[model samples]
Target: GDRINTVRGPITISEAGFTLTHEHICGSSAGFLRAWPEFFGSRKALAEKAVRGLRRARAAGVRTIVDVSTFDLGRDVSLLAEVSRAADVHIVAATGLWLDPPLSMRLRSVEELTQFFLREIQYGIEDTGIRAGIIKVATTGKVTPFQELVLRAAARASLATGVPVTTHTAASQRGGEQQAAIFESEGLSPSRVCIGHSDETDDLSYLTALAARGYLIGLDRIPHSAIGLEDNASASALLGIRSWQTRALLIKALIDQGYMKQILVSNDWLFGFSSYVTNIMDVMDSVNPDGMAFIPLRVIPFLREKGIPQETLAGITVTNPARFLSPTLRA
Candidate 1:
């Protein structure tokens, strides 16, 4: 395993390229499945679909993908490694439990969780020769004790491994602040962490605050009314154009205030969702077959059309994420 230094400490990774900050090649919600058996499906079949999606990503100019699907939700590293080798795209899988409402309580103590992440990091680096590029943790809106523990574990593990951390923030103004505070308390700087889903809130002040603290904010949800994937469906569409306009103005303002390089963008598309079985392709077909592929294809063009200079777009989409993911690679 190759060892390299990072904000966290030392991590290992493969070659570098355009890294998708957040994506899920495959995911299965066992909880949803248990509650609704019809939702469950064969893992092998899902893995095959993931392989295909990885290839599509390659053809789309995506060289690296950070798969942040964590435990109990189909975070299969073995399959990830297989797909990575087959697709010839560097796949950096995450290790950590996702934080939801009541289940957040189960994350108390964090010692076990920390150890779990450490093992995954070690296994990916040592056994499989596939390095885990980042540690993925999440938080809920309400700052419960459980959430605190998870953040602390994430911090500790990050500190130990030097792998950057990414978070799933709640869909509220204070969500970013609350989650960032927890990481700060654990001595983890915001620069090495990304607050996922910050675009959902539509609160520029909150986003700016986190960016001010050096956190990388992800603005990667597809912004279209018909692209209903998550709770941020509507907000994503609005913010993609409306909020992004506001954010660009804000970024300009911040730059005018001497604060450049504080924000970034991504398309947190869980590609596996676009598969035939999930009916995502069908949904895309229903919405606008021509437009379904438009998102991944035309996102850069749209940004350019919106006055985001090609250089800046390259920074947000390429340079920034490359710097973030490079050193974290296992040597």
Candidate 2:
């Protein structure tokens, strides 16, 4: 039980090295690729692009990646397994609905949703027999009724399965707190959850408040200045956000505040996607040229030069993620 479930299978915690906690390989609407094959190209091409990016991260010493792509986010476990094999990187897959769950799911009861997530965590996703390593739930900014219901379901599933939960938060609106409040009401430990996308905002108070309550703060969106353009409705872009350098400094500030153990860092980089408007790579690479290796190749070096201790940085990228991913150990 003291293991992390990866796409390839279970691996001991010690086997996970230099982990990127929040990231995606090929995210799209679940049925988009099936409906419009002409838009996404071959699955082979998508796998190759992911392999290239992941291999670069492997070269930069990324041994494990938690792919937080859920059912609605075009989660392909077979693709994840193949990518993990191709790139020689351990990938932990997620199983939970993302922001816009289908009406069928929304109409289901909280207990029904919890059982659905538990089935994915316990039995398997579909018939692939690849159990999800982590539970994921998300909200845009405010926690709508449906979003809260899913959050409750995630919390219940996590409590029953002893799997750590990760989340997508709208940092600008201090959305993490809204999620935290919901999880707390469900009687789940704050330590068992990671409030993701905490780096999207400059609100140190919001981050610290969550950290102070033993929540793992995910500063995962490294060098994400170009992710979501305002006009790009499809993209999860935050308009006129703070600089990545500023986000780095904020991470340093959290370390300074003695919350290093409570922090997790990642690039949140995506490899490719199915698109009809323009080349997805061009849009992604326009601002983030480093690809998946951004954290290890760029931000880490920058942080080291800024007087952050090497051991401290290791704890952020290595030890912390290992601990975060190993929920059953504590149980």
Candidate 3:
């Protein structure tokens, strides 16, 4: 109960401080880096950039990052371990599927898929001897038949391994509800699931309902609302919320409603992503100049100014993630 699995190995729950519950250390279209390594500043440069990003996050009070890159999303646990060692931050790797399930995967039955996840959770991912710490699943707007298979597989994996599940949801459409319903049908407890990207909308009905059902609400995706906007008005019209302040207010509302323990905050940032146009680094920098530090450097201060207590903010950044990721652990 004291241990939480990380890329490097299990660490005690107290070792997990200010954890970013959802992120991607390295993610892109499959083979994009292999096809054109130079385009991504080479693997060396990209790896260094990931280390730098983690360093910045560490400076901003982050101590761990739950990297939610799954098989289809270009998960590289070896590189993740190297970066975790280099940056001296705990990086928890995930095992599951992303939005696109290849034809081969779609052809597989639920038990077959669940066995694949169990291999990663119990043994290692791709024989790397680095077991996955969590299960990552995704659903947008609606859950397709195949996505339901993956979701059920993830739920079954979590139930078998005692690892928690985190998800990518299209919050505007209340996709978290659809995902939770599927997990519930699989007999997975709501406490073992985190409804991610709840920050994408300001409607408390969807988010609060999820929290009310004992599901952890991932107020992750801070960068989505801040990208390419100078003011809250344009961001509100374009991104469906004001700036990060809108998310901050949502956090305050959840806290006010006594659901503070159910909230997990993060940016969902990634270092190595695909881009056919201009340099992705410049684009990401424009979105989050502080890199992975955006939440602590920008949002936390804003939350303080809005009178959300510092201890409550700490619970969001630290306690919530520890509890969600290591549900059996006791402090």
What TM-score should be assigned to candidate 3?
0.93
Cα lDDT tens digits for candidate 3, 235-279: 443243356777778888999899999999888888866622345
lDDT for residue 254 in candidate 3, whole number 0-100: 93
Which candidate model has the greater TM-score, 1 or 2? Answer: 2
TM-score for each predicted model, relative to the true structure: 0.75, 0.94, 0.93
How do these models rank on lDDT, best leading? 2, 3, 1
**What's the number of clashes in each of the models?**
11, 1, 0
Lowest-sum lDDT 10-residue window in model 3 = 232-241
For candidate 2, the per-residue lDDT at 58 reads 96
The best candidate by lDDT is 2
Tally clashes: model 2.
1
Kindly report the root-mean-square deviation of model 3 from the true structure over all alpha carbons: 3.0
lDDT winner, 2 or 3: 2
